[PDB]
Design a binder for this molecule. Structure first.
Ligand SMILES: O=C(O)[C@H]1NCC[C@H]1CCC[B-](O)(O)O
Ligand SMILES: O=C(O)[C@H]1NCC[C@H]1CCC[B-](O)(O)O
Ligand SMILES: O=C(O)[C@H]1NCC[C@H]1CCC[B-](O)(O)O
Ligand SMILES: [Mn+2]
Ligand SMILES: [Mn+2]
Ligand SMILES: [Mn+2]
Ligand SMILES: [Mn+2]
Ligand SMILES: [Mn+2]
Ligand SMILES: [Mn+2]
Lengths: 319, 318, 317
């Protein structure tokens, strides 16, 4: 089996990273749609590591305004050890979320085995708010701030985040689909000189040129591991409505598939995160199934599923 | 103008697929006022009526291939009618009906113009052979019967003895592919057919897709163009009333852009409007939405431009 | 900043077209908190109020052209107000109202800045003359009254004697055309006006469309820009509450791109947000969808960028 199709499923039923309950059922509904079975139909080497058991911390006191610091920090700490275990076996770590605060552990654990990795962040938001710049206190919009090497000293010592060691630099992360960025978040994005492709850049260049520039920026000099942190709210709410923070004028169903198809084509996808799938925030049961079917289609395109077609290495006309 | 001289051919046929209602396609396309709207944009329109597809009851399946004699005779009858329309110097407009009728529509057009180029706008390749197919529906098998390179791979199917492969692998271009079977993808890649799947449409844009399509078919020499348009090629948000709808399709704008560029070459000689099923809609609005989009696609093929259209007269001095 | 100094003008007028409710356009735009959202965006906002349009009795139609004296007076009153806003060093923001008011908005803006360039975002050319029109609705006739090359082709219509042709055929660019009348297409091609119909938008992409639009109008040297935005220029799936909706229009993203690019030049001098009709929304959701889109379009004209916006201070320390 090919390295680009060898996967290691990791279930992350966590929700204390944001104030809306239901996102912890994300890995459950994705499995119910037959994600592991549809991947095996695509000639993929699939090995399940099950759902991580996240213990309850009732004595979790808020740091300044930051909500559930010990619960979020422990969840990512438990995920980091599991993601590193999947990478040691030589398998692509597939984290099923859950909120985007789990990206702290998923990227840290992946960096323990492959420290030369590049991050492609598909989201409507930067998720770069520091515990001092945050206005909501939700840690699902704070993962990148804890992971950046350039922000070493600007991040205060929040309880449960002691294990966190900055692994990625400002030049090793690329944003795709930005359309709802906070004033504090936009300042950090421009001061550190991080490469980004907001909806303005996607409309200007087209999804073809956006993917051509993204891959040439991270792989142009040398072939390095790729970590794709995919937030479903990165796509328009017409395709992914069952999510925590929906923002209009997002990436289309075709644009999302094109991003994921080009990432598979490089044969360097090493880490993958499917985050913010909330089956309870859906207005109708059709809106819930639509978000899950889109999230499944995004995942299958990461491991081989191409729109032009897929065939086994055999003669179909003369078998 | 020859690019606006049309010959309407009604093809009420549904035995190419298992879902009933697609035979009512020419009836509901006419009811939307297609012939009236074409005469409005200065087109010379001649209606040849609906083809009388006689009932073939004794039609046993070939292995798993459903209704072989009915599909074969319907295409053989359409081939004779399309050739008759082309002999009178008119653009053959085949109102479908299921896409299996393309066998006869392209074969009949090839009898008068053998040097023609095919533009296949569809979500599917329809290149399954009677042996590689899994459903046995002939509506997903037309391209296999027409390709010269697949000679020796098509078995003796009852009702298809008249079929002679007329188009080469280099004489066909696909646009809008997003649901291709493993057997179909093997044929598409081995024969080296030029294709623009939804991945290529997202990569280059509909502008470069059409620029490359016309340069690939009219590069060597200017030759007649046959446009086989399956309404499922467009997204189900514009054409929901169809048998096989697939998400992430061509937009209403992309569909108009393809058809507007094909008219501007002045080489469109054959056109198929297939898979319009007025009984496979969730609401009556979804049925009217598919037909209005199908009529808009057809009007753009014969002159209707979004920038505007005007007669060669002084509008400021009537 | 000069690019964020605005002068709000309310234009509750509907006699340019037959569908009632477009006069409630500035009312629902204000209810959505447009002025408040602009002030939060570090904009210097001055509200000149909603213009009172007195009902003219016995306004007989000129041939087939409906309500000529009402449309003419509404544009005459708007011309004086737009010029007053331009003299105070502010960007004129006209809240419509039907698109016939563009006669007054562009004329009044041209009285202070005669070297202005017009960017017309619309599904229609609105270039019909009082003789080529088949409906007689003046909302589809504003460009004909404004063009210098069409002087002598426009008859003496009552209420329009004050109109002086202020823009030339080379000074206007259309974006998003898909429903152009035969008479209108004849004028568009014979005058050699630059246009980017839905066909050109699909061909080049909104990125190349904006690059060519701004290079064609500003190429020689920096000059004022008048953006006349008709909400029907965008697809009816984003702006359904409108008088003349045409399928296959500009997306919500494309509309934000056009407006984000015009702000970046720092030369936006005049702005029209027209044809918002809250009575033409099938569901109250369709009404809010159109107004939310119209507000987003207006905010992008005065700084709101999708990549993010921040004050000139240190957010870390
Ligand atoms: O920091 C926060 O809590 C908020 N500031 C930007 C929008 C919102 C975060 C969006 C949710 B997520 O981080 O998952 O993209
Ligand atoms: O071979 C088949 O029966 C099937 N394979 C793909 C979808 C289906 C064929 C659909 C025919 B048409 O594209 O015209 O809708
Ligand atoms: O002249 C007319 O009455 C009509 N010809 C095209 C459509 C219609 C004008 C629409 C005016 B507007 O673009 O502002 O909605
Ligand atoms: Mn996120
Ligand atoms: Mn997000
Ligand atoms: Mn087909
Ligand atoms: Mn099809
Ligand atoms: Mn208008
Ligand atoms: Mn309009």
């Amino acid at each position: 089996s090919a390295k680009s199709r060898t996967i290691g499923i990791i279930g992350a039923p966590f929700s204390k990273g944001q104030p809306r309950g239901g996102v912890e059922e994300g890995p459950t509904v994705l499995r119910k749609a037959g994600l592991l079975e549809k991947l095996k139909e695509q000639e993929c080497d699939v090995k399940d590591y099950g759902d991580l058991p996240f213990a309850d911390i009732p004595n979790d006191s808020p740091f300044q305004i930051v909500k559930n610091p010990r619960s979020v920090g422990k969840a990512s700490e438990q995920l980091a050890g599991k993601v590193a275990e999947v990478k040691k076996n030589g398998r692509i770590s597939l984290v099923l979320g859950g909120d985007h605060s789990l990206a702290i552990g998923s990227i840290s654990g992946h960096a323990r085995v492959h420290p030369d990795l590049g991050v492609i962040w598909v989201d409507a938001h930067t998720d770069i708010n520091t515990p001092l710049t945050t206005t909501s206190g939700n840690l699902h919009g704070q993962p990148v701030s804890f992971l950046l090497k350039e922000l070493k000293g600007k991040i205060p010592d929040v309880p449960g985040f002691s294990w966190v060691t900055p692994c990625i630099s400002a030049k090793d992360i690329v944003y795709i689909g930005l359309r709802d960025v906070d004033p504090g978040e936009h300042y950090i994005l421009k001061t550190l000189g991080i490469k980004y492709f907001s909806m303005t850049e996607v409309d200007r260049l087209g999804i073809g040129k956006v993917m051509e520039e993204t891959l040439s920026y991270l792989l142009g000099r040398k072939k390095r591991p790729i970590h794709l942190s995919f937030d479903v709210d990165g796509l328009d709410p017409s395709f992914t409505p069952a999510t925590g923070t929906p923002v209009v004028g997002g990436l289309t169903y075709r644009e999302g598939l094109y991003i994921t198809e080009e990432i598979y084509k490089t044969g360097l996808l090493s880490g993958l995160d499917i985050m913010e799938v909330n089956p309870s925030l859906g207005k109708t049961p059709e809106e819930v199934t639509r978000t899950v079917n889109t999230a499944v289609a995004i995942t299958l395109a990461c491991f081989g599923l191409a729109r032009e077609g897929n065939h086994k290495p055999i003669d179909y006309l003369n078998p």
